[PDB]
Amino acid sequence: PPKTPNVVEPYKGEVAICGLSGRYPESANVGELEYNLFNKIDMVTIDNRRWEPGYLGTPERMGKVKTITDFDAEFFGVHTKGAQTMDPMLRNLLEVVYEAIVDAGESLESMKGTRTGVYIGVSNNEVDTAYMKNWTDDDAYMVQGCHHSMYPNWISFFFDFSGPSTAYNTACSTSLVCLDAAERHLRMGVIDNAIVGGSNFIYRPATTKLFMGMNFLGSSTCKAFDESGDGFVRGEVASAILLKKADTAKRVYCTLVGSMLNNDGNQTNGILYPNSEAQEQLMTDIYSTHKIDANEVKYFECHGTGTQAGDPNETRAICNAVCKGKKDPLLIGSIKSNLGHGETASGINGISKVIITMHSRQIPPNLHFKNPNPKIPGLFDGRLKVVTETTPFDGGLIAINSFGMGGTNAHAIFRSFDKRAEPHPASDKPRLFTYCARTEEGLQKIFEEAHKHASNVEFHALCQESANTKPKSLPYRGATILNAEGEYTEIQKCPSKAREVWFVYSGMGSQWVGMGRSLMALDVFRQSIEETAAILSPFGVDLMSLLMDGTEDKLKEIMPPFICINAIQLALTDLLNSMGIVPDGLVGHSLGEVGCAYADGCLTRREAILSAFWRAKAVIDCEVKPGKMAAVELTWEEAKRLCPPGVVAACHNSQDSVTISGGAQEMTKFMAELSAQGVTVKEVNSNNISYHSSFMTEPAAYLKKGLEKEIVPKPRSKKWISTSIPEERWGNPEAQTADASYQANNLLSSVLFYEGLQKIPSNAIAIEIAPAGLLQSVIKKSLGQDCTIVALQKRKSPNNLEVFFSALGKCYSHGVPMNPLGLYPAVQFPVSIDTPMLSSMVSEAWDHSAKWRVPLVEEFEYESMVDQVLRAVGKVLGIKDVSSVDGDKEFIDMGVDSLMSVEIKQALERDAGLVISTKDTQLMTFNTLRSMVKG
Amino acid sequence: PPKTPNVVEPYKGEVAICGLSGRYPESANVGELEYNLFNKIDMVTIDNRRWEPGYLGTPERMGKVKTITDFDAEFFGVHTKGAQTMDPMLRNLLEVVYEAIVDAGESLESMKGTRTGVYIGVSNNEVDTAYMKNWTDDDAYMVQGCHHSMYPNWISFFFDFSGPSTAYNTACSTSLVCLDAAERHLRMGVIDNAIVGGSNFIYRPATTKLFMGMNFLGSSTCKAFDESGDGFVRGEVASAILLKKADTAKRVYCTLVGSMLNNDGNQTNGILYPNSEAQEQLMTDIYSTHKIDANEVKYFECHGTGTQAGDPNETRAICNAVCKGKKDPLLIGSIKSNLGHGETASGINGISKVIITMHSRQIPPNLHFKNPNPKIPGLFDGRLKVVTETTPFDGGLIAINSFGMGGTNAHAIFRSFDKRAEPHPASDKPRLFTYCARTEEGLQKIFEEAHKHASNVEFHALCQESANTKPKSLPYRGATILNAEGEYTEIQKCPSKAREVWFVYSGMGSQWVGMGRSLMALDVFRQSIEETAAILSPFGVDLMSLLMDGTEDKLKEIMPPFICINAIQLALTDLLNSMGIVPDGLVGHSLGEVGCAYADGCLTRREAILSAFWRAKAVIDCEVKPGKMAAVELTWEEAKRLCPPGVVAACHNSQDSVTISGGAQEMTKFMAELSAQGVTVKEVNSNNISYHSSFMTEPAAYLKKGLEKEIVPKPRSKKWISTSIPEERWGNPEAQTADASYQANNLLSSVLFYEGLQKIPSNAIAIEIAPAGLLQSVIKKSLGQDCTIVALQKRKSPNNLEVFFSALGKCYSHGVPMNPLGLYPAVQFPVSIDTPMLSSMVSEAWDHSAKWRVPLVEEFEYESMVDQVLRAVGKVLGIKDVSSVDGDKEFIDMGVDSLMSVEIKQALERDAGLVISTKDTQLMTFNTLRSMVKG
């Protein structure tokens, strides 16, 4: 019950900006914004997206995002009623925050429960005048979807953050005040991360008239640093960034040297007048507190509103504070000439441009700077130089200003991160890129981008850091092979419920020439084979020779097959363990029970390899009379009844396949008799040995004496399903350890494989670990129809590495977590600054089928009971089609909130006899409610 | 040009809340709130202040402030157009911020230019829809008066703060979020003060309907900790507080131990559900980081919303975090059962109640707690105990919570300030309380309150710290005598222009028995007399005896009169200097030239007293023939022409008063001749000595020889107007130092009093420093009609101390700064916690004649050229009556915010030939523009 206090201690390390995302005018994501900036593309257009070009006399040109009617409500657990009565700014900001989190190499599970603070800056409540003009019942949810205090809070609620979540409103410099607050809270010890951001969308056509009446707005696009500048043009943004401590960041765009804020005071030129002295003092203070040499600034992201009273004062302050001592012109610029003035999102726009500049390492061109302003002497003395074309920013410090209306100025400094990429051993060999998304098209675009960056391993690591999200959040799971000879790509929708992973190990018969030869490309496989060959060398076996240059005649013998099959199984187990696949169950077929022991932790590499060696040695050295085996189609009981003395049933493969083994003459007589009637009999290459029969009495004992001094007894976990001891005898002491006794019993007694395959669930993902998919048909027939089956190798395949990668991609697509990068040396974090951005992929990989309400200009001017209860409950939540939604998703995952729980309880009482408490309602699924109503 | 960087260094000292003010439901100020809380008065009433009791079905009862239609626009420099288009919340908050600043012992001049940050918390933006339903031109000013980012900024702009000014919106826990930001910024070193505050007024009934639709509101008043609680009732607050470093605070209500914030995260009970674990963890973290023993908390200001889901969880968290180890019940309470739920101003309500509990040292009662909630086990186990009646809180720590909707919790701890008052030497003697205000009634109420606290000197010091504000801000200047035998009270409206304080020193004839006897009550006067008597004792003069037990016969001699008059003049000069009155000019009548030198710094106490002693000794010892003097009504030229040899004109008193002096026989003949015709001749008691005549040739030389070895030569400042050397000879070397030559010349040559009184301005404030108002009539006639005249003493007065205090009160009322507390030992700051609050006085002392626009319910549903130019300019600003406003107040002082300057310039060009730049327009007065148009 007692709660451990948190260690709130001041932080003295570096603060790194890790992820960036946002919607910008004529740019659906950061990549489009970068492309438009670097191609001198003006993002301020004229159309009727918001209102007619001239409605109420407002300026025709504006900066508008592509769309604000799109949102993935189901992903964020917000119901239709709540989503409809929610600000489009909040929806776009939630999407952008998720995209930024993914961009920084973080995920939903990694950021859940962390001490992260949210510092959204928003100031536009026009969606409370349009939605209230015709207020009707069911619009109360606006309280939780439209209040400006709900912007960060929702981010805290969805991502499960537990840090200060506050909303700021500092006019046109709020985004940098949020950054300052995040720096203040990070350097004291309250939080380790920050979600500083900001959104601003234009809805009311009368606010532009308000801004025009004060002479704020100009005629044309913002003419930053231009003599003809007469105002700014409004813009829209939905941007967000993620800040983390530099020591724990997996990607570092840059470092936050420091940010500071100040005010102008009682100036005689009016409240809406910039104070050059205040800005100059703020700059001097920020550059002196951190001891930053102001002459080191390479680029200066100015607050270029384009007015005749703002640009001269800002330039004068910059010249007095940062150009004192500079021996070369200081490159100034702004993003307001490209996409206009974002109002409460100007600071976030400047931050985005600074990050783009320090990521692409090139300064975006500045538009509309034709004639220098005569009132800006710095442009004629050589102190200032507007960057009118792409300039190669190599490295250093970049300063950003944000002068909000009213005199509340803000400054910040960012230090570029110089960790240029170095080649990885990978990026030239095939790799398995696994990911997840909300839509098939989104995942296809993600795979296309991954192929575009097939030569980058840091990008693959950043993608993988968030590629293991649960199917509930990202139901579309997919996998593709980069740097592959043959194209491969799989995408499947995986239900919320997680299926169980079962490792199925094959026995004898998987031998062939070249087994595992291709898989030598992987370092881990070769290392495992070498560490097994070193073990087996002192016993007169050169595993490497038999595996690489071995021939069919060599594999005809008894030893090399056993040795090679065990080596392949152990190496594949090592590959899977390195890749991070934990098996929920383990089953094997005699000779694959040593591999099962190894994978279960009950045995070791030495123990397993030597157990197989001892088995083969005991079989060969003893003069066992020649025998034969074969898989007949007779049923288990039929085989047991029909087998005469001398021939018995070795293994119970499946429902209609049983292995008969016995002496050569009696076996041949059985073959003739069975072929006489209608029965399918298939002979198996057992090297003329009848395993699991009375003939194995003498070998088994020998094996025991062979392995008593080598196999240490260890416990057997319940995951590993025995296939040598009957189910009813699992509780006996002999079925507790995989000692020499267990090996002898397995080598002697029958193989009950059908029972072990029965114990498997009805939808388990069973992976056949073996040199070849020997028991594919047997396993598929035994399991059923709902069980996914994959083989890690294919016989005589031209390339087995691709087969292995495709098999594991199929396994991932069906919902098994794994780490494909575990087969290669780990990437050192933070990654190089050359790693592409992952935000664009997520931005274009959303589920946006539904269109939600947006403010309009016209609003600113003035039968089975079970199915019955199912439909009633679904309607209460707000789902038109109850059957459409998943049956394993809890109610809380949709957005059920207090009032809906009581309504559900009352509806159930009025409809059926159930009486359910409120708490249990939010954690019960549709399938569960159907089960209880049936009960 | 270079700017000195600020020393941004972390602060480790204490932070103290110094001021408090605000409007509360049914409470015009903090005093009314305290009275209502301590008398179990419910502040939630039912009436039609906002809307009908039941309009749209909203709850009838609400918490509403007295009025929101009142504002002193002229005081804050906001024009009529801006004030009309300004949120009433912002206006009330500006008034409350000024009241809080005054309460903490600060003033406008002291807080101007300081590094103070403003952290207003406001969420309500309902006045935007009402003002936009019928939008028309001239409403563009809402951008600078209605935007939420303009709430702190205006406070920064008016008070001239230069620190982070930000607006916060965290919902019901925004006030403690601003306190957290203020603590964060104060401790980093950016700021030295903070104006943390927040306002919330209800305007739209549809908002109440929206809240009701979410089940937020209940039926009756907030039943905090009551089993029948079912919701909260909306309230209104406009409170604000001032925080300062404890070392520089002049008043300390308490100390901010620390505040912290946290979030709830992804809770399964919905976003609008309190998280007990989150609140408990926040409490544990805050009490562990500061090492505060949670068992030391005496009172706990809980966030008692009164809901069935909020109170139980908050109480459980409090019990788990702060009641672990407590051996006595922990007294919990809330300010929501008294005045309801303030929404975005609940934390400020809690802070107000905490500062009231720790100021009055009594815990206010909690209302409506009839039956303990059965879900709160702490109330039955003895761990918790709601304070249902006034409880004597002695001292310790008080904790406040603020759980905002959405899950953003906040905690803060305050340590009481225990500095109980100790008696001052004053508080039983008469004192001069001087103050200023905006209205006569307000100043009368202020004086009534001061009389109520006549026994408190710390209260007087707190009032005096802000009693020297310029007449522009507070035109009504007043003064009253506390602890006075006779009631005195003066209140006058002083123009913006500052008048000159001229000292006038009288000469001979001010003698009388008991001169200065009453003024011995003042410590400084007695000390000065003692330090002069010690000087004059070695020369055979016992000043104390002549001044205390001296008789008429003693004063008939020559020495005692001169000695006593000089002693009184020097003691009054010391009294004035200690009080802090700097004279812009000094003039004196012969014998008052030594006092003028002393007050001007050209002489010392020793030098002046010995100069008078030497004058009297030279006059007496030499056998000067008997002479006589008298002030005739003749003019200067007439006296010069009509005087025969042997009788001359000594001093030019006024225009029609000249002093004739000469030998006894010739003087008597002159008396007979003048009385024969029509002329008024008044004889002056000069001890039968004819001063300023040829008879003084021998004495003067002696005086020179007497004073050559004593008086060191020092420069004479231009403030002192010589009345012994003609104007045309002021530049000569003799008129440079007050050496023995100057004394001899003054004692010999004539006195040019009238000429000295001509250099005095036409509206100067001349203070007659002397034992009696001898030259009252002469000076009044000489100066004119617009000059204020005051005498510090009255002859034969029953009490001179009261006369002196009344004289200085009259002087202050006309606009001369002074410090009446300089005559007593300085009060040690911070003051005792028993000092009453000054916020209430200022709150009820505003100029609220004009009524401004307020949101309405109906809006939520859908000829000389000089005078011509004067009227045009006044109309441009928005003044209906141009002549009404002061002619010496600059345009910037009335609210000009650019744009209007361009309009003024264009109007002047279109109306007259003037072409004035924009910058000069905001610093030019009406009288100045009239002068230029005339030119």
Ligand SMILES: CC(C)(COP(=O)(O)OP(=O)(O)OC[C@H]1O[C@@H](n2cnc3c(N)ncnc32)[C@H](O)[C@@H]1OP(=O)(O)O)[C@@H](O)C(=O)NCCC(=O)NCCSC(=O)CC(=O)O
């Ligand atoms: C009957 C079987 C042998 C398989 O015969 P089938 O013809 O029906 O199988 P199938 O039709 O799917 O054949 C094609 C698939 O089998 C794979 N395959 C690999 N090697 C094969 C081989 N020698 N013969 C036939 N198929 C083989 C192919 O790669 C291909 O998979 P793909 O193309 O996808 O890659 C099986 O049921 C089985 O394993 N029975 C038990 C044998 C056994 O282990 N007994 C235990 C004692 S021997 C032992 O374990 C050692 C000891 O006891 O000491």
Ligand SMILES: CC(C)(COP(=O)(O)OP(=O)(O)OC[C@H]1O[C@@H](n2cnc3c(N)ncnc32)[C@H](O)[C@@H]1OP(=O)(O)O)[C@@H](O)C(=O)NCCC(=O)NCCSC(=O)CC(=O)O
């Ligand atoms: C005529 C005056 C004396 C004042 O007579 P008036 O009666 O006309 O003035 P008034 O009616 O307006 O007010 C007179 C105020 O002074 C007081 N008062 C008047 N006559 C007084 C007297 N003989 N003795 C003591 N006090 C007297 C009154 O109580 C009253 O105090 P209240 O009004 O408070 O109730 C003055 O005008 C004057 O200065 N005369 C010339 C004195 C002079 O300058 N001598 C120069 C050198 S003598 C010198 O300095 C020494 C030296 O040369 O070494």
